[PDB]
Design a protein around this ligand. Structure first.
Ligand code: HEC
Ligand code: HEC
Ligand code: HEC
Lengths: 135, 261
């Protein structure tokens, strides 16, 4: 199954303990999604020494993030980083409402109809699986 | 690097670092040109007009200035004189409140109102090559002059509107101009070195697209790249943001046309 964005259970710390999909997290595919501007765009802000070209320095290096943070905290950061870091510049990847002039990707066009999350449940679990190896 | 002097053609001293304007002193120690955030190779392209590709377009606009256009049979020069004199200082003080309009005007809106109402000529596309090259000419004859846009009086409510927009998060990525340019200036987004997002160097010649880029063009692309809907070029929103962003660099020299990534 999949847990829809509006149906996610988030605790008081912004932690999400249950996965968004029960399909297994592919650590190999999560690595890929992080370099794509069209998906995660994680590199634009974050260093991952493991990936091995021009990572950003807005966000902290993600080396060893699995060693400092619970999986539930890592997923939570990806569902809605603002729950975990208030007023953070990190986009909210599993939010579908509460935006201001959202557009369809980088097309400058207004979204008409429902908002799809920046990443799917499967894409988030792929990326979570991959971050969990950074110990 | 960031602290090396910018002198253009051996003659024009550019103030690239200045005391933060009082309205902004909260946030920065110091305001800086986007030039101070560029590589040495890119920085060098602005040090000589012969090495500055934007100046090719400024040279072509010099001809346009003197060429009669529209049904009235008149050229810019027929009312404004030599461009070096008639446009001197003007890039430094716009956007500004204009009496005949009872509104803050940009340089483009002034250029278009001359074309349509004084020249009998067709409007230029706000961010098209014709407008951007003329605006670059205008800027270039006031290089080394301090940007000094009024933020008070009949300009104030427009300035406040632009201020609101600067700190408003847009798009599905949910970012304001300050998100990146105030909080994270001097950091990297990928290979790009975050500047303070100043407009004193505009129109910019960008190595990315090998052309001149209008202020509202940049602004459009900035909101777009939050995964957002940009305001229209020439809109009251972008006019207001331009006055406000301009005010963020009061004291920096005029640099247009500048060379950037
Ligand atoms: C050729 C396309 C041009 C360009 C690039 C500009 N002008 Fe004119 N100009 C004229 C008058 C009477 C004004 C004042 C208008 C008002 O108060 O509304 C202007 C104004 C401008 C500006 C702003 C100047 C300033 O000092 O603030 C600019 C940037 C500008 N113009 C550029 C008169 C004329 C003409 C009389 C027949 C002609 C032709 C032009 N201008 C042509 C041009
Ligand atoms: C707009 C910038 C931005 C982007 C894009 C971005 N991040 Fe972040 N991220 C941050 C910042 C800044 C922090 C630190 C929290 C803070 O102070 O805001 C952070 C924190 C984190 C953390 C917690 C790490 C720590 O040590 O604090 C993780 C894990 C993380 N990000 C992963 C990701 C992933 C995965 C993506 C892609 C889906 C991503 N980031 C995209 C800016 C960004
Ligand atoms: C996603 C992060 C981000 C946001 C949000 C953002 N920018 Fe930028 N901006 C950049 C990057 C990266 C550059 C290129 C490097 C630099 O800053 O010179 C840039 C460059 C600029 C420049 C060019 C500066 C120069 O010297 O030529 C201007 C002007 C600018 N931005 C204005 C704005 C405005 C106005 C907004 C709000 C609509 C905004 N920015 C929002 C990332 C951002």
């Amino acid at each position: 199954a999949e847990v829809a964005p509006g149906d996610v259970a988030i605790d008081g710390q912004g932690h999400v303990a249950r996965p968004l999909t029960d399909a297994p997290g592919d650590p190999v595919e999560g690595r890929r999604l992080m370099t794509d501007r069209s998906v995660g765009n994680c590199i634009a802000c974050h260093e991952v020494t493991e990936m091995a070209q021009f990572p950003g320095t807005v966000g902290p290096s993600l080396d060893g993030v699995a060693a400092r943070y619970p999986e539930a905290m890592i997923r939570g950061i990806l569902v809605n980083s603002k729950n975990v870091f208030p007023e953070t510049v990190m986009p909210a990847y599993y939010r579908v409402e509460g935006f201001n002039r959202p557009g369809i990707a980088f097309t400058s066009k207004p979204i008409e109809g429902e908002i799809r999350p920046l990443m799917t449940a499967g894409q988030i679990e792929d990326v979570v699986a991959y971050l969990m190896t950074l110990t | 690097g960031p602290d090396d002097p910018l002198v253009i053609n051996g003659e024009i001293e550019i103030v690239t670092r200045a005391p933060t304007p009082a309205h902004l002193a909260d946030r920065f120690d110091e305001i800086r040109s986007g030039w101070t955030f560029r590589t040495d190779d890119t920085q060098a392209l602005e040090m000589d007009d012969f090495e500055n590709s934007g100046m090719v377009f400024v040279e072509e606009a010099r001809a346009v200035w003197d060429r009669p256009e529209g049904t009235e049979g008149k050229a810019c020069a027929d009312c404004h004189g030599a461009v070096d004199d008639g446009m001197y200082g003007l890039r430094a003080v716009y956007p500004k409140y204009v009496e005949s309009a009872g509104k803050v005007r940009t340089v483009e809106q002034m250029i278009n109102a001359c074309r349509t109402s004084r020249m009998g000529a067709p409007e230029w596309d706000y961010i098209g090559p014709d407008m951007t090259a003329m605006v670059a000419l205008i800027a270039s004859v006031s290089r080394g002059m301090p940007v000094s846009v009024a933020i008070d009086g009949p300009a104030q409510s427009t300035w406040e509107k632009g201020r609101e927009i600067y700190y408003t998060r847009y798009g599905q990525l949910d970012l304001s101009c300050a998100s990146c340019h105030e909080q994270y200036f001097d950091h990297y987004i990928r290979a790009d070195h975050l500047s303070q997002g100043q407009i004193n160097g505009f129109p910019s010649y960008r190595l990315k697209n090998a052309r001149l880029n209008a202020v509202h063009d940049r602004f459009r692309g900035c909101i777009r790249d939050t995964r957002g809907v940009p305001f229209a070029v020439g809109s009251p929103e972008f006019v207001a943001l331009e006055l406000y962003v301009a005010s963020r660099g009061n004291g920096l020299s005029v640099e247009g046309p500048s060379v950037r990534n």
